[PDB]
Amino acid sequence: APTALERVQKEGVLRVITRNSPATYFQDRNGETGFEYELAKRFAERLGVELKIETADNLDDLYAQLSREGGPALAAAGLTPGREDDASVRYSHTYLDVTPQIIYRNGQQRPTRPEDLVGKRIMVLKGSSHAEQLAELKKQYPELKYEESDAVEVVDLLRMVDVGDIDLTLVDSNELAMNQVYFPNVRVAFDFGEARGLAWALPGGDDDSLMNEVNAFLDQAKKEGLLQRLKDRYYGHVDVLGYVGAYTFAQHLQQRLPRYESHFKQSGKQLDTDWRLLAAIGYQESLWQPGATSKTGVRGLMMLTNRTAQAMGVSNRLDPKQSIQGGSKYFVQIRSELPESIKEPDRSWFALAAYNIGGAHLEDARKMAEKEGLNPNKWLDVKKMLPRLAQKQWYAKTRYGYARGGETVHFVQNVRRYYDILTWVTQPQ
């Protein structure tokens, strides 16, 4: 009889079940994203098969699907293995350590240990390891009360805390980091339990043909730095922006962006470009503040120089609509002017670089890349060269000389992250 691996290879497709959420798998007009989506896509490529994503609305359904006749090959969904073995399911080697955290609302008193969870309105996801944690606690503190939802995602639980619908929830630290940027009031109360490893889940039984390939792949993903890169993209917001930076973005998202969103959308539509990337530029430049001012005379929401403003037909840099339109037009123009050899998505990142440092200094970095045997059409390569423009040992012999290339790297990195954050916004219940 055909093995699990042989079935997949024969069918030419790897069916992967997951949750529908930015952390795992998420659809947006510009494509599909998610930590689990990208990791599973790489695994399917390793196997030389097509990835087919299936989703479940809660964990019970996810595990039921995995254990059904005709079910998917594996589940990739930020799964925490249960405390006890169950014949219905087997787990891979773990690929991410996360820490469960009790989450509370700033403005209310912070519980600091498990006993403080008594007397609170708590909600967690049904069928979760988090629910098990509380069930175990309830044996010690019978007055403990908590509710379980089988019809929402973690973003919804965190929103409930943010607006005061509940007092507390319990989530994985990576989920908190990803969502901190949406909820200005949520805070970590304390770490509840030891860190644990997330793992892919396979059907029960004694067929190890696919499992061994999964584990070989995960080890390779770790070695290549793929796990780290995905971790940083999806779960790195607090690591990179800082914790205060993260919940401060959340405040600005709630209070400032609604004042300007229509302008960004208007400009994006007329320029045929994603408004959320435009908005991300605006956040990095001014934190969405139309009266902002840099040290060097640059002003406004999109931080246009007077030269750029004039060139774009901006007559008032301090007017949010004009700044947005001018900055957006400029970004689009310089993206269009990039060498044809630079392809998307890299092309957009090079355009961000040029927005900040100008096309001339950017060309110097591309020339440097080529000289170093790197690919001048790949952003990740040229990004390595940009900081050299701030160092005399490198910039003195370049055509255009000194430039703050380190700043530019930071600029592009931050805008790309804010762009992701805006793309991953979901609607409340």
Ligand X SMILES: CC(=O)N[C@H]1[C@H](O[C@H]2C[C@@H](C(=O)NCCS(=O)(=O)O)[NH2+][C@@H]2CO)O[C@H](CO)[C@@H](OS(=O)(=O)O)[C@@H]1O
Ligand Y SMILES: CC(=O)N[C@@H]1[C@@H](O[C@H](C)C(=O)O)[C@H](O[C@@H]2O[C@H](CO)[C@@H](O)[C@H](O)[C@H]2NC(C)=O)[C@@H](CO)O[C@H]1O
Per CB under 5 A, residues contacting Cl ion are: 21-23, 390, 404, 406-407, 412-413
How far apart are CB 407 and ligand Y at their closest, in Å?
Answer: 6
Stretch that binds Mg ion, among 57-65, 86-94, 307-315, 418-426 (CB under 5 A): 57-65
- Which listed residue (6, 32, 50, 57) binds Mg ion by CB under 5 A? 57
Footprint on residues 331-370 left by ligand Y (CB under 6 A):
356
Q: Is 363 a catalytic residue?
A: no
Can residue 32 be called a binding residue for Mg ion (CB under 5 A)?
A: no
Of the candidates 36, 153, 175, 285, the residue annotated as catalytic is 285
Q: Encoding tokens for residue 300?
A: 């406004």
- Which listed residue (212, 294, 315, 391) binds ligand Y by CB under 6 A? 294
Q: How far is CA 266 from CA 154, 276, 278, 299, in A?
A: 32, 11, 11, 21
356 binds, among Mg ion, ligand X, Cl ion, none (CB under 5 to 8 A by kind): ligand X
Can residue 410 be called a binding residue for ligand Y (CB under 6 A)?
A: yes
Residue 102: φ, ψ to 5°: -75, 130
For 44-63, give one letter per residue: b (16+ CB within 10 A) or e. beebebebebebbebbeebb
Sign of the alpha-carbon dihedral angle for 13, 14, 20, 22: negative
Stretch that binds ligand X, among 81-89, 187-195, 295-303, 385-393 (CB under 6 A): 295-303
Footprint on residues 397-416 left by Mg ion (CB under 5 A):
403
DSSP state of 6: H
409 CA to centre of own chain: 18
Stretch that binds ligand X, among 166-174, 179-187, 296-304, 412-420 (CB under 6 A): 296-304
Cα separation, 215 vs 359, in Å, equals 45
350 binds, among ligand Y, ligand X, Mg ion, none (CB under 5 to 8 A by kind): none
Q: 63 or 331, CB closer to ligand X?
A: 331
Q: 70 or 297, CB closer to ligand Y?
A: 297
List residues bridging with 83 in a β-sheet: none
Can residue 127 be called a binding residue for Mg ion (CB under 5 A)?
A: no
Footprint on residues 332-361 left by ligand X (CB under 6 A):
355-360
- Which listed residue (1, 69, 140, 296) binds ligand X by CB under 6 A? 296
Can residue 308 be called a binding residue for ligand Y (CB under 6 A)?
A: no
Cα separation, 12 vs 188, in Å, equals 44
Q: Encoding tokens for residue 210?
A: 């696919």
How far apart are CB 314 and ligand Y at their closest, in Å?
Answer: 16
List residues bridging with 170 in a β-sheet: 102
Q: For the chain, how long is the longest CA-to-CA vector? A: 74
List residues bridging with 102 in a β-sheet: 170, 190
Angle between helices 257-271 and 320-337 (to 10 degrees): 40
Virtual torsion, Cα 109, 110, 114, 115, nearest 10 deg: -20
Residues known to be catalytic: 285
Contact footprint for ligand X (CB under 6 A): 294-296, 298, 303-305, 308, 327, 330, 355-360
Contact footprint for ligand Y (CB under 6 A): 284-287, 292, 294, 298, 303, 356, 407, 410-411
